[PDB]
Structure 1
């Protein structure tokens, strides 16, 4: 036969790739959303004076 790339990768190996490689992106984008919400809240309470 003819070999392929990503031919012997198991569904366990795809799980340990995906849950540790896209989960990092999920953590960094919820860090961005949390920082944006904190910045907007602190600037919103400042508007009164």
Structure 2
């Protein structure tokens, strides 16, 4: 071979799209859960005050 292969040489645009969707979706879902927990904590605080 006249060239040098790299770790990401074989990752296609569609493969990157799916990787981004899986990582972003799972991260966004986690953030949604954390945000909802913090918001409800504030709602309860306002319930007492």
TM over 0.5: yes
CA distance in 2, matches of 1:4, 1:22: 24
RMSD of the alignment, in Å?
A: 0.9
CA distance in 1, matches of 2:39, 2:31: 12
Residue 48 of structure 2 corresponds to residue 46 of structure 1: yes
6, 20, 30: which is aligned to 1:18?
Answer: 20
1:35 aligned partner: 37
CA distance in 1, matches of 2:41, 2:5: 52
TM-score (norm 2): 0.83
Gaps of 5+ in 1: none
Write out the 4+ residue segments of structure 1 that deviate beyond 2 Å after TM superposition. none
